[PDB]
Amino acid sequence: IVGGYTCGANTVPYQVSLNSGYHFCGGSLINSQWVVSAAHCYKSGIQVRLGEDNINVVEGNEQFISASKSIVHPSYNSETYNNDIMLIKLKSAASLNSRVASISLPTSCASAGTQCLISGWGNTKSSGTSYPDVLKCLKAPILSDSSCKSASSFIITSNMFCVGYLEGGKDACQGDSGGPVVCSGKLQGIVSWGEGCAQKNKPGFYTKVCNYVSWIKQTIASN
Numbered sequence: 005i006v007g008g009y010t011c012g013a014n015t016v017p018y019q020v021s022l023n024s025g026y027h028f029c030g031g032s033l034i035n036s037q038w039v040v041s042a043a044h045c046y047k048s049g050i051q052v053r054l055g056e057d058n059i060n061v062v063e064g065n066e067q068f069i070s071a072s073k074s075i076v077h078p079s080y081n082s083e084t085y086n087n088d089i090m091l092i093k094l095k096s097a098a099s100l101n102s103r104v105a106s107i108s109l110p111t112s113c114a115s116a117g118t119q120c121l122i123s124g125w126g127n128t129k130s131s132g133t134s135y136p137d138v139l140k141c142l143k144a145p146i147l148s149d150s151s152c153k154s155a156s157s158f159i160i161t162s163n164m165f166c167v168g169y170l171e172g173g174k175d176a177c178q179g180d181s182g183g184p185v186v187c188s189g190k191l192q193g194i195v196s197w198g199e200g201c202a203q204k205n206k207p208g209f210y211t212k213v214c215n216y217v218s219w220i221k222q223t224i225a226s227n
């Protein structure tokens with residue numbers, strides 16, 4: 005997260021860290037045994053880390069649970085970035101508490117102009133590299149489709165939306181991928197891609213979760 009702030013320990017209790025010997029992506033807990041993340045974060049042997057604040061210190065409140073299934077959307081396309089969503093099933097159900105909590109799936113798509121909360125342990129620099137110990141947060145608005153398209157040098161699909169600030173300085177970044185965008189208490193986005201981070205007229209792009217609610221429910225029910 006570039007140009008954000010320290011969330012505060014466990015203030016985003018649905019935020020998870022995907023770990024393969026180090027933190028590499030975020031995710032969102034949607035029930036006690038399933039996490040929503042990005043298809044492009046797929047790796048085998050993922051450990052999901054719940055209840056984290058400082059990802060480098062055992063503070064208490066952590067639950068580390070291996071992924072038993074990592075289900076990439078069948079229509080994920082790594083060139084076009086369409087359908088950048090993956091569902092991770094936890095080997096065992098997490099013990100839900102105040103610091104480890106699910107986030108609601110949407111019943112309708114979020115409204116253009118709404119200010120949403122993006123979070124993660126990704127790079128905090130727009131140029132160069134600095135990774136935080138503790139969870140970072142950024143509030144930013146959903147931009148119009150027309151604005152997103154005008155900003156982007158890449159083809160935007162109906163399964164993407166953009167959120168951020170066109171003046172630059174405020175964005176998700178590397179290592180935030182797969183983590184949440186929450187709008188009015190609903191998980192509306194997954195950190196997906198952007199042209200660099202926090203550059204002028206290059207806002208962040210996010211998987212549009214409201215398009216996948218039926219798919220998510222069906223896939224969970226059958227697995």
Ligand SMILES: N=C(N)c1cccc(-c2nocc2C(=O)Nc2ccc(-c3ccccc3S(N)(=O)=O)cc2)c1
Nearest residue numbers: 083084085158175176177178196197198200201208209
């Ligand atoms: N600024 C962000 N919000 C953000 C979030 C996560 C990662 C990165 C990021 N940090 O460094 C690079 C990045 C990156 O995502 N690059 C990138 C650019 C374009 C595409 C893309 C989008 C749509 C269609 C096609 C493409 S592609 N795959 O042909 O380039 C994909 C990835 C930035």
Ligand SMILES: [Ca+2]
Nearest residue numbers: 058061062063
């Ligand atoms: Ca920790």
Ligand SMILES: [Cl-]
Nearest residue numbers: 135136137138
């Ligand atoms: Cl820090």
